[PDB]
Design a protein around this ligand. Sequence first.
Ligand code: MG
Lengths: 134, 133
Amino acid sequence: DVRWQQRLNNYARALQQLSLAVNLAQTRPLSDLEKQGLIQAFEFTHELAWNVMKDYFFFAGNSAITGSRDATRESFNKGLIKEGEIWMEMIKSRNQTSHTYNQSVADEIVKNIINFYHTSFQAFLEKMQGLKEH
Amino acid sequence: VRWQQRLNNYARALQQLSLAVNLAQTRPLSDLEKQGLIQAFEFTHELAWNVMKDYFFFAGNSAITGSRDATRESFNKGLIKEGEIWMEMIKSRNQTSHTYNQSVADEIVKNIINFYHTSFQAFLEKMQGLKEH
Ligand SMILES: [Mg+2]
C-alpha cells in the first residue's frame, strides 16, 4: 500500500529532470517558454517530495498529514529538512502557478528554484537515501 | 464577480500559449519546452473555466465549484461545442504531477497542439461576442 521508498525512486527521477534545466540555466538565459518548463519541473518535483514525507511519517503511525503544509512542518520538526522557511516558500510558489503568465511571477519563481529550491531538493534526497539504507 | 475582467486575463494567457504552439510548427520542442507548453496550457485552462463559472454566476448559478461543473454547464448552454475535448483537458490537468514521464508529457503536448488550442480560441471568440451583448 504505502511505500515511501518507491515514492523516493520517482522523486529522484523527477529531480534529475529538474537538475537538467537548472544546469541549462547556468550556460545561457532561459527563454520565457523554458522558464514555464522549469516551473512545471519544480511542481512535479515538489509534489513528490512532500508525498515522500507523508509516506515516511505514515510508517511512524502518523495518519494526520493531508497536504504539503502538514508534511513540511512534520519534516522540519523531525529533522528531515533544515530550511523550514524555504520549504514553506515552495508552497507559496505552488499557489502562484495559475499566475505565471505574468513575467514578474514566473521570474520570481524561477529565481527561487535556481537559487534555493534545487539545493534543498538535493539535500532532502540525500537525507532520505540515508534513512532508506538504515 | 467580473467575468469580463477574467476574460481579459484569459486572453493574455492564451496569447502566451499561442506563441508556444506556433513555435512548435517551426521546429520540435525540447523536453523542457514541452514542460513549458504544459504549464501554459494549465494557466490557460484554469482561466477558461473560471470565466465560465463567473459568467454563470451572473445568471444566478452559484452551484458551480470546479472545472467539471463549469465545463458541463458551458456545454449545456452552448458556450462550448467540443464537450469531450474540454473534459479531456481536465484529465490532462490531473496528469500534471506525472509529466516527468516523457510518455505523459508527449500525450498532453499532442492534445494541446492538435485539439486544445483550437478549442481555446473558439471559446475566446464566443465570450468576446457575448461581452458586446
Ligand atoms: Mg504546472
